[PDB]
Amino acid sequence: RHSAYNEWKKALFKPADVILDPKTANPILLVSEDQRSVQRAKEPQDLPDNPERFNWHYCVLGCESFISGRHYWEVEVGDRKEWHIGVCSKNVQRKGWVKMTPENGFWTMGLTDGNKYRTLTEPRTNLKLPKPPKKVGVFLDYETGDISFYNAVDGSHIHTFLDVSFSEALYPVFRILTLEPTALSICP
Amino acid sequence: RHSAYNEWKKALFKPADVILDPKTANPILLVSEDQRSVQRAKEPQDLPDNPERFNWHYCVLGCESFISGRHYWEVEVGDRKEWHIGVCSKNVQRKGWVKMTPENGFWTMGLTDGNKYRTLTEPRTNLKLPKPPKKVGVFLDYETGDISFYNAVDGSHIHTFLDVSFSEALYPVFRILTLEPTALSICP
Numbered sequence: 325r326h327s328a329y330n331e332w333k334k335a336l337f338k339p340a341d342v343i344l345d346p347k348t349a350n351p352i353l354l355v356s357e358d359q360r361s362v363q364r365a366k367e368p369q370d371l372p373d374n375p376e377r378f379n380w381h382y383c384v385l386g387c388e389s390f391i392s393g394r395h396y397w398e399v400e401v402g403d404r405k406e407w408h409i410g411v412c413s414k415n416v417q418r419k420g421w422v423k424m425t426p427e428n429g430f431w432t433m434g435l436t437d438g439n440k441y442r443t444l445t446e447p448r449t450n451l452k453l454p455k456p457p458k459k460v461g462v463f464l465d466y467e468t469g470d471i472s473f474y475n476a477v478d479g480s481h482i483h484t485f486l487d488v489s490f491s492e493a494l495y496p497v498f499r500i501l502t503l504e505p506t507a508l509s510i511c512p
Numbered sequence: 513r514h515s516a517y518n519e520w521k522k523a524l525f526k527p528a529d530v531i532l533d534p535k536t537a538n539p540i541l542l543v544s545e546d547q548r549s550v551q552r553a554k555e556p557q558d559l560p561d562n563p564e565r566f567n568w569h570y571c572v573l574g575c576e577s578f579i580s581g582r583h584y585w586e587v588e589v590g591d592r593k594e595w596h597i598g599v600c601s602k603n604v605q606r607k608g609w610v611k612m613t614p615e616n617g618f619w620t621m622g623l624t625d626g627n628k629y630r631t632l633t634e635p636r637t638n639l640k641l642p643k644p645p646k647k648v649g650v651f652l653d654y655e656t657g658d659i660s661f662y663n664a665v666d667g668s669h670i671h672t673f674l675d676v677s678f679s680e681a682l683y684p685v686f687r688i689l690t691l692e693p694t695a696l697s698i699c700p
Contacts, residue, residue: 325669326669326672327662327667327668327669328516328517328520328521328649328662328667328668328669329516329517329667331660331669332516332520332524333516335524336520336523336524461516472519474515474516478666478667479515479516479517479666479667480515480516481513481514481515481516481519484514
C-alpha cells in the first residue's frame with residue numbers, strides 16, 4: 325500500500341533481490357526452483373559437502389553479500405511456528421557447530437515454539453511484539469552498523485542490532501529447523 | 513517509538529520547526545504564546561488588517577516557507593471535529609474569499625462534521641480512512657511535487673497530492689472553523 329513503510333523503504337534502502345544459494349544450503353533443506361523459498365526434508369538429501377555448504381546448521385544464504393550501503397529484503401514467515409533470519413559474515417564457521425551469536429558473526433532474530441520471539445544473542449533476548457508478524461522486513465545499514473527488523477505489513481518495530489562494527493561482507497541468512505506445511509519465502 | 517515511520521521520517525525529510533505567524537492569523541483565531549497552537553474566539557479580536565493577515569478565511573500560516581527540498585511537520589488534531597491543514601503558496605489571496613483549492617494555491621485536507629475526511633479539491637474528494645487520526649504528518653517534497661499526509665501514530669496513508677509543479681514558495685497552512693474545546697497543535 326502507500327503506508328510510510330511501503331513508500332519510504334526504497335527511497336532509503338536499496339531493495340536486495342535476494343536469491344537463495346543452493347550450494348550453501350544444509351542438505352536437509354530444499355531450495356525452491358525459483359530460489360525464493362526454503363523447506364525442510366524429513367531426511368538429509370545426498371549432496372556434495374562443498375566448502376560453502378552449511379553441514380550442521382539448517383542454514384542457507386543469499387547468493388550475494390554486502391560490504392557497504394543500505395539494503396533491504398522482505399520475508400514471508402506466514403504461520404510458521406519456527407524460523408530465524410538476518411545476516412551473517414562471509415567467514416562464519418559453516419562446518420560443524422558454533423553458537424549462532426553476533427560474536428560468531430550471526431545477527432539474527434526469529435521465532436521458536438510458535439510464540440517465543442527472540443534475538444539470537446548471548447544471552448538470548450525475548451521480544452514482546454504487539455502482534456505476530458506474517459512478513460518481516462530486514463534492513464541493513466553497513467556504515468552505521470544497524471540491522472533492523474520490521475513487521476512489513478504495518479511497519480511496526482521488531483528489533484534492531486545497533487552500531488555494529490562490521491568488517492566482513494554480510495550475507496542474508498535463513499534458518500528453519502521444523503518440518504511444517506508452510507515454507508519460508510523471500511518477497512521479490 | 514522505533515516504527516519505520518518514526519525512525520525514517522527524519523532520515524528522508526528535514527523536520528520543519530513550524531512556528532505559527534500571528535501576523536497572518538484571521539482575527540477570530542488565537543495563536544498560543546508558544547506559537548504552536550491555534551484556537552477560535554467567539555468573536556473577532558481587534559487587530560490591524562496588515563497585508564499578510566487572512567481577513568476572511570479562518571487561516572494562519574507558519575513563519576517560514578519552502579522553495580526546495582524535503583520537509584515535514586506533525587499536527588495533533590486530537591478529537592477536534594473540524595480542521596484543515598497542508599500547504600499554500602506565498603501569493604494566495606489573503607483578502608476576501610477565494611475557494612481553497614490547488615488552482616488557487618492551496619493543497620490541504622481535513623475533517624468536517626466530526627467524520628467527513630476530505631481533500632480540499634475541485635471537486636472535493638472523500639477519504640475513507642482505516643481509523644480517525646489523532647496526529648497527522650505533513651510531508652513536502654518540493655522537486656517531485658508531492659505533498660503527503662500520514663497518520664503519525666501508525667504511519668498509515670491519508671492522502672497524497674502527486675506531481676504538482678510548484679512555482680511559488682510554500683507555507684504550512686492551518687484552518688479551524690469551529691469553536692470547540694480542543695485546539696489544533698504543532699508537535700515540535
